Write a protein that binds this ligand. Structure first.
Ligand SMILES: [Zn+2]
Lengths: 397, 49, 397, 397, 397, 133
């Protein structure tokens, strides 16, 4: 894995640094590493592919070394360099597509393809170069069991869970009470509704609560906390819990009284925020507890007093919402987010070559089913395949 | 030594580094070093063989 | 173009690496490239500007070489380096503003300014240095006709198109049926509505369909697909197709039954998703086909049954929506997105100096009119001017 | 500050470049800088911490130099390098946590901790290395008073201000007129409403206006301008200005007639946009002026004409909205945004060690109260602490 | 690709030039290239085929050089030359059939077979010879991104689209108005018909219009423009738009009044022709706009006046046609035409060996579906496979 | 006219035959004709265009000869050949567009542009090559 990143880093630098007309002192330390790579890789044969429609390709390396005698690199040196680089780039492309496609339940952090099991010897250890990308740094730090952090912009930590809860209900569905939520991507939109608008609740206050457990512990998260959840604020008809009948929801929106957002780690309150909106911070957490309440307004104009009678027919239903959007967060485990394209590369390789469903990953690489049951073996497989995807995304655009 | 090849070579007084042949009466240049002298500043406009 | 990136890369590195007190071995390979640059650029004169209010500036280069004899760089070397760097940075700033402002219908990928046409000689080819940024890498790969990819975060692939379609309509506008949509940035919000709620449709099911053709083929796109389009879910009055009269739209929201999202490339179904929300992936596509349908709920509580009569007056109109947001995508052509500022730099240079409208780009650099008719000559001009904008964004902050 | 970035850059590179089996010419210029660092740092003692619960740690440096005699780096050299690197990484971690925690009203741009005041001598100036990150580049450019630019993706330039304005009001609250807005993060959502729908306004046109002053001058901003503000488009009950009574808001949405978005710098119109939506650009501005108007539709179908009578009871209130979202912008001062995590690191360090509220920063590091009153001393403190946070985010993940 | 053309050019010349009795000075420069080819190709082994029913063949080259000592070539030299040439011709035949059969969505311009990926090394670069055919010239010019042109005789730029349009229609289908067209190969036959013969149109003139967008930009096209489209001039019965019922079309032919043929490039009028028939020229265009109109004849003999009553039953329907036939055109992209047989060779190789449908090309190599959606990846694959087809058409008759 | 076809035939063949890695004996008779062309065309200046919107371009030829000492043509020789060929191709393109645009009632078979009237001398007659089209 280290030598695969090293091959790709030298091929990236040798497409970048070895150009026409450049001075030799700019590339004097790269040509020695590329010659060490050629010297190491000669005499060895590899075999990539063999699963799904990924074709079996045989790789044989017989190349001459590059010259170390120019002052300015002329176009002859650039053309022979481009030939050797194009062959090695095709090789590492097929090794990366052979490694992202395989998985194992037993020990997923180990290389699974034959080519990367062959590259994991000490004969190939002199290929090794700097490990400067974030994924290979976290690979090398977790290979020695130290703390890592992946910085994500809007991480997909929440599985898709659009549902509700009726704390007070009946088959008439004309006096309901409870919460509704949308957990999607990095965004929680929650809305507790009461049809009576707390006309018989004690002190005209109805307490709502919504507890979101996470799968991995997020660290140093900037979170936009806004009131008035926008999706649960227009009238809609909703199927029941058993899916038998449908019930109508005509909301009018009160502001959330007494918002308490708590960030729990192992049941301990790490951060708490009482009636503070805008951008908040949560330093260390794996559970988000939103505690908002609906208070009936004690003074109402005649336009408002016709909405909430004391009797039964409520044509306008009180609804109170919050919105919580994790903008950026540092997570020790791998995830998906709106910035990288690594999950897209993994799914593109697994869908392009018509790959059968294996023992670990969900069918079709369903990220909702992958983050719903995010086991440590699936975590190891996901980190390995994302690291190889980062390597191929360095070489192949 | 490599960047100062030109400054050591072009301050030599034994050698001169090329000759313009123009076949038209370009005028003798005034220099405080040499008086009037047919010294050239650049090899521009013509063929560097 | 390669030598312009090389000038800017050396000036960026020489502002970074050549500092006070640093060791000479840290900068021993940069000073040789900077001296090669000085040796190449001496004796040459340039002329920048001359269009709009961009002033004509004449550039003459007569500089001495930098010293190669220190062990730790003292402040004398730093001050003479800062002088030479500030002159070259002003030169390359005016060359980049002279190149982003010009365009050509005939061959836009060629340099248009006089200074960059003069820099495209082999006399200046020894300036050349590493080409490590994404735009100059894709420039060098498309100069040899190989595959490229620009990674965008929320790409502006959709032109602004807010409109509707009435599959069933009359001048009374009290029983309507059809779709509405908002295509903006990277976001499609579509909503099919029926006023009758499929009370006379066969099997109480009304099929909707919305086909969005793209202008360039996106590759490996992560897409957030949510139901219940939020913008088309509140009551509004809307002008008619001819703009004569206005009609009222009072929606109640059903959930989308039988969502089928298909990603078409050349009419072939590449990816398909049947009733799956959350984050989806689309590996290769240039057409997005959303096929959702409205089903009348067969079991309704008395709060719902008063909304949808069998007769004509429908005060509550059934509406079903979807939202599709491309979070990140790899596109072979250049675009604009929410991450880079290159389009902003191009428009700032073209608006600061009061530049007349030329033959290629839209008046005022309208991105909606630029991506509506995204011709290959306009594509070449846009890629060239974005590459020069990336170069200037390296030098000028 | 320069030497602290230099320590962290060498430790990052020496975790990256000094690996097992790599060629010596790849690391031949880094080992000399790391040996210069060891030679400079020996014989010196430091003391970090001492505020809040940050513990006092004493630092003593007595290390041998690294060998310069290998061809390929073996595992002995890697293990002794990992020891020296882990000690220096712990040192620079505690220096950065000692510097981010302190502040001063008098001159905030100066180092406040004892360790960084000791590192600001010329004895430690030979530690210095390249300054390539964006924050240390802008630090070095503003240390010489030149122009800088921080590129932000969705900058938090707006303080949280959710409020309204009643241009026409009475204690009955049945015929109201005025604007409502949400300024949050990078997003302005504004909506002017009239209950009469301009039935007595001249030419049936009511002019709205919303002026947002900024705190710092943004430059080259890409801005998504959409109509029909989504948050102020559903019915809600709202407390009054004095908080005494509540009033009801039942909106129906007209489209915004005659949108004029102006970008003011010092009262001068820099950019203007008349009825153009989608992505717009604003090259230089510190005030955003939105001027939209509500026009009564002169032709209405019978479904619309029942909504707006000539008499007093308006059960459906005309409402017209706009949405303005700054996607990316270049600002000369430091800010927070959705891309970086530096504010999250600063708040995590200040909240982890239970730090008392000082003279400059708001209690609890409230970003709304920090950008509401964004004084230049607070600007200097914020830039210094964000630079140190960027340094620690390079070392500590 | 260059070396494959070079192999085929030398084998073609060595079948042509090396004959019995010819003088040695006629072939003195060809035998040296053929000996360089033998020297380069010895010691190498190849493997062709392996997809569909194309059989796997292994190629081993162990040949002696040809003699350089004759004055007139005797029959011994001709027979040993014919042996070596027949083996190399069989080799290059199987390499070309192995390359035309493969394709790739990712980068189609790269070689896909194992043999041509092995021939793309610099070891085989000394095989290279003159590149004089049109396809290898345009290959070498587009490998450096310069302008190319393929000269086609009657190019198949139009997909098969036989359809119509009813501008005025009813379920009776007795008073119709609109256009009909046939786009096939290089020929557009269009005919606008009116059943009333403009008896109620303003000024007795009905304007027709037919806009044909092209897929690739044609350049310097000679076009035969004739009036009176022959296919839409006899009575026929035609199915409706939904295919439900059929309607009758009994045409009588008027001449086309006020013909305006415009050749649009990016919406700009490049060439225009007003009432000029015969051979016309169109220098640069990608859209063809035909604007003809039907004028009712103001003076009619009694044989004509019985055809067009003022009342409803029209047994004779006015019909006006044009015919536009592109005889020859220069196109930058590859196409098919009536002169070459390259598409026929590609389809013959893909149909002879029973090849499965891949990701790029349409099933069965449907040229209508290939030019309907003519993507740039399909363009690159088509150009590569046409170049290899041209090479094999040089060797194999 | 004969020398214009000869210029174009040598430039076509020198784009075709002078490639990277080819043997020198394949191009040994073309490089001599191309060097004869360079030797003939040096020291001469031309002026193309000047009618309609065809722009006036001035042409000056100062080129070095190509090397005759390789066994297989390397990429240096190919790049300097591509430079000289691209300049001569631009020259002959503008001469051909200057000649197709002009006409004469008196004797149309004679060259009308100034550049092709200058090329019709016997100084330029040693440019001449095969006339096979
Ligand atoms: Zn983002």
């Amino acid at each position: 894995m280290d030598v695969l990143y090293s091959l790709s880093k030298t091929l990236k630098d040798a497409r970048d640094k070895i150009v026409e007309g450049t001075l030799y002192s700019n590339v004097s330390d790269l040509i020695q590493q590329f010659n060490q790579m050629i010297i190491t890789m000669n005499g060895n044969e590899f075999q990539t592919g063999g699963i799904g429609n990924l074709p079996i390709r045989n790789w044989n390396f017989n190349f001459g070394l590059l010259g170390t005698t120019l002052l300015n690199l002329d176009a002859n040196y650039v053309e022979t360099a481009r030939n050797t680089i194009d062959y090695f780039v095709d090789f590492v492309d097929n090794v990366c597509m052979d490694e992202m496609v395989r998985e194992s339940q037993r020990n997923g952090i180990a290389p699974q393809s034959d080519s990367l099991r062959k590259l994991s010897a000490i004969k190939f250890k002199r290929i090794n170069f700097d490990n400067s990308s974030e994924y290979i740094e976290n690979w090398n730090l977790q290979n020695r069991r130290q703390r890592t952090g992946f910085t994500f912009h809007k991480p997909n930590i929440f599985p898709y869970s659009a549902s509700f809860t009726l704390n007070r209900s009946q088959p008439a569905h004309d006096n309901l009470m409870g919460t509704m939520w949308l957990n999607a991507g990095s965004e929680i939109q929650v809305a507790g509704f009461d049809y009576s608008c707390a006309i018989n609740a004690p002190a005209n206050i109805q307490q709502f609560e919504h507890i979101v457990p996470l799968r991995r512990v997020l660290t140093t998260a900037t979170i936009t906390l806004l009131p008035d959840a926008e999706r649960f604020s227009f009238p809609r008809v909703i199927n029941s819990a058993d899916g038998a009948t449908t019930w109508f929801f005509n909301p009018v929106i009160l502001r959330p009284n007494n918002v308490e957002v708590e960030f729990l780690l192992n049941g301990q309150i790490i951060n708490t925020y009482q009636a503070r909106f805008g951008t908040i911070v949560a330093r260390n957490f794996d559970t988000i507890r939103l505690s908002f309440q609906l208070m009936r307004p004690p003074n109402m104009t005649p336009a408002v007093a016709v909405l909430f009678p004391n009797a039964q027919p409520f044509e306008h239903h009180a609804t109170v919402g919050l919105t919580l959007r994790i903008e950026s967060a540092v997570c020790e485990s791998v995830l998906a987010d709106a910035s990288e394209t690594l999950l897209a590369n993994v799914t593109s390789v697994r869908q392009e070559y018509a790959i059968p469903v294996g023992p670990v990953f969900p069918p079709g690489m369903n990220w909702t089913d992958l983050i719903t049951n995010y086991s440590p073996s699936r975590e190891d497989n996901l980190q390995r395949v994302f690291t190889v995807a980062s390597i191929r995304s360095m070489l192949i655009k | 030594i490599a960047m100062n090849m030109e400054q050591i070579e072009r301050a030599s007084d034994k050698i001169a580094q090329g000759v313009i042949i123009a076949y038209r009466d370009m005028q003798l240049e005034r220099d405080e070093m040499y008086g009037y002298v047919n010294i050239a500043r650049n090899l521009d406009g013509f063929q560097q063989i």
